[PDB]
Design a binder for these strands. Structure first.
Ligand SMILES: [Mg+2]
Ligand SMILES: [Zn+2]
Length: 462
RNA sequence: GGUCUCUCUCGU
RNA sequence: ACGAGAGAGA
């Protein structure tokens, strides 16, 4: 992706969008109990911790565009993927506004605890002023779909969250593009059923992990991904995508039966406008972070990308022997013969993608189940039942979370959640965690899950 | 102060 | 089941 122009809001007539500049994060009662080196992300240009210009840092992610149209490797990649999806028989028909707005069995309702985006957010209009759980009223929606129409600009906010110290120094906070509720509704109406299908079928047919539950999914992945594992990280995946990958997406949609009216919406997320503070700017390429379908479209593109890269980098690739699961930019994949990602990465650079060794390795090494990660979790076979696989969230990470809170009122829930993640690392690590938590007065006041009970409940899931 | 998923807690 | 809240992941 790449910024095409920047204009002041006076010149575009777009309402200023301002977001909070102070973090909700505060050190917790456990801050000094556990070691960690993340802090709240820079939210403001005059952050003492800065070492670079904030705004230049923020937008440096739009590295530019290389390809704009599909070459023949990408076309072939598209069609191989699209043919694979066909067996799922996605209903290409349009979802009703009621279901799009209020949800189904395989699609959660539009989040009403969350901004309504442009222009409501600057008009003081929240989602709850237009939508109602109990009424399932769509009447007000319709009136506004007409009043403000579609393709409204995304509202740019900085993400309040913990970042590594190096990232706080270098101003590399992350950005979210709040979608207008109008575009969310319409995108959900156009692709709601695809959403449903993908949520219901995490695995190697969708080539997507959206909808998975790591507690149980982790045991299938070595059966779903037979043979030689490969994986790698992307730097700035979303923003790095060139318009060709959106053309590529269009070809997949067409091939599985979407109308041209439907397919035409892809260009409306390849080419987007955004309001950050007092300015309007244009982005060509780049997945808009907070559009409806972000995770699914990113996963789908990632499936195209991996196929294209394989058949361009190597001779004799049989795409049918590829297995992969993506979650956005995150990937785990397998092939009957080991795939050298150094080479894939070289090819990826010609496509505008920056690919790095899995897990901040210094160089491209072998990926095996013993060191693979996915959704930040490792893979650790249970000692008693080796076919049952623990997702292992590293205690290091968990230590980062517990050292802060956005509201110490919810400490109990927060700690319990961490424990639910922690225990997979085993008894000795888990009790080490627990007794460190007990080492502090609030800690002794918390209900902490018993290990054996966690384990026993885990086994019973199978 | 986005899009989503998963899980937990608390209600009725 | 419906509501509310949280945590984590992408
Ligand atoms: Mg990964
Ligand atoms: Zn534009």
């Amino acid at each position: 992706g790449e910024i095409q122009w920047v204009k002041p809001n006076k010149e575009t007539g777009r309402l200023n969008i301002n977001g909070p500049t102070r973090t909700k994060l505060e050190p917790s009662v456990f801050h000094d109990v556990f070691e960690g080196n993340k802090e709240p992300a820079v939210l403001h240009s005059k952050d003492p911790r800065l070492e670079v210009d904030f705004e230049q840092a923020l937008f440096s992610k739009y590295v530019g565009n290389t390809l704009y149209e599909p070459d023949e490797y990408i076309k072939e990649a598209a069609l191989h993927y699209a043919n694979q999806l066909k067996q799922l028989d996605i209903d290409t028909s349009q979802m009703s506004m009621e279901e799009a707005c209020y949800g189904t069995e395989n699609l959660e309702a539009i989040d009403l605890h969350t901004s309504a985006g442009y222009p409501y957010s600057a008009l003081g209009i929240k989602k709850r002023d237009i939508l109602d759980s109990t009424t399932r009223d769509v009447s007000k929606m319709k009136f506004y779909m007409d009043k403000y129409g579609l393709d409204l600009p995304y509202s740019t906010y900085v993400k309040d969250e913990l970042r590594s110290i190096d990232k706080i120094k270098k101003g590399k906070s992350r950005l979210i593009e709040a979608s207008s509720l109008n575009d969310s509704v319409y995108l959900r109406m156009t692709f709601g059923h695809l959403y449903e299908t993908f949520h219901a079928n995490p695995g190697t047919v969708t080539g997507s992990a959206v909808g998975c539950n790591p507690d149980t999914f982790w045991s299938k992945l070595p059966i779903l991904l037979p043979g030689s594992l490969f994986a790698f990280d992307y730097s700035g995946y979303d923003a790095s995508l060139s318009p060709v990958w959106f053309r590529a997406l269009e070809l997949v949609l067409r091939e599985i039966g979407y109308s041209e009216e439907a397919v035409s919406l892809v260009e409306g997320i390849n080419h987007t406008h955004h309001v950050y503070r007092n300015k309007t700017y244009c982005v060509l390429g780049g997945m808009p972070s907070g559009c409806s379908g972000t995770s699914i479209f990113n996963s789908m593109i990632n499936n195209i990308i991996i196929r294209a890269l394989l058949i361009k980098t190597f001779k004799g690739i049989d795409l049918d022997e590829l297995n992969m699961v993506a979650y956005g930019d995150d990937v785990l994949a397998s092939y009957p013969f080991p795939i050298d990602c150094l080479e894939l990465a070289r090819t990826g650079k010609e496509y505008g993608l920056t690919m790095t060794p899995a897990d901040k390795s210094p160089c491209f090494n072998e990926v095996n189940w013993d060191n693979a990660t996915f959704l930040k979790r490792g893979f650790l076979p249970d000692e008693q039942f080796p076919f049952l696989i623990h997702p292992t969230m590293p205690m290091k990470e968990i230590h980062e979370s517990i050292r802060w809170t956005k509201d110490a009122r919810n400490t109990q829930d927060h700690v319990r959640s961490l424990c639910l993640l922690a225990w997979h690392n085993g008894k000795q690590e888990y009790e080490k965690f627990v007794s460190a938590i007990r080492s502090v007065p609030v800690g002794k006041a918390l209900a902490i899950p018993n290990y054996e009970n966690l384990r026993r409940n885990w086994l019973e899931l199978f």
